[PDB]
Design a protein around this ligand. Structure first.
Ligand code: HEM
Length: 157
């Protein structure tokens, strides 16, 4: 309802610390480096699902937009935009409403998010990044997923 307030509840409930935020903000340049490959993995994953591939069929110009929206969203987890504040919360809430409007649900987004976290965890291990960075990214992916699921709850109901 009030994005900034939902954000404070989500950072407390997922236990995302000042330390986590520092690890994310420090890894941001690396996040920016891997984002395009993450976008490609995600696109291919969605493409292999009959139901989710049907949903991704508005136009071809959609491919660029689907790649770019993903790259910016992914990088933003590392920077937090306004340090995981009001603008972050408003952007995450708008992301939630977009998915509810196109008729995608928990059966799509919860697994999709499991695949993102799995794919990022592979990149982290490839690059021999810290386990503390890996935990922090797990936390912020799950904040973002709560925003999407909460939007679906509020727009449904
Ligand atoms: C962790 C999961 C996901 C994330 C983080 C994500 C992220 C995004 C973002 C940032 C946007 C742009 C929203 C905007 O306009 O402001 C978006 C749009 C979209 N997403 Fe997702 N998404 C996810 C899952 C999915 C899934 C499972 C589908 C299934 C097909 C999907 C289909 C779309 C479509 C069709 C759009 C609109 C693109 C357009 O404007 O033409 N997304 N998503």
């Amino acid at each position: 309802i009030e994005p900034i307030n939902f954000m404070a509840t989500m950072v407390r409930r997922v236990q995302l610390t000042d330390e986590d935020k520092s690890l994310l903000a420090e890894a941001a340049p690396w996040g920016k480096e891997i984002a395009p490959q993450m976008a490609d993995t995600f696109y291919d994953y969605l493409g292999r699902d009959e139901e989710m591939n049907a949903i991704l069929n508005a136009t071809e110009g959609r491919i660029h937009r689907l790649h770019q929206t993903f790259v910016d969203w992914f990088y933003e987890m590392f920077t937090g935009m306004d340090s995981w504040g009001k603008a972050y919360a408003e952007r995450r809430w708008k992301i939630g409403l977009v998915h509810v409007r196109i008729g995608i649900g928990p059966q799509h987004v919860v697994p999709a998010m499991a695949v993102v976290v799995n794919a990022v965890r592979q990149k982290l291990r490839e690059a021999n990044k810290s386990e503390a960075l890996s935990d922090a990214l797990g936390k912020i992916c799950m904040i973002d997923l709560a925003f999407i699921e909460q939007a679906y709850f509020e727009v449904s109901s």
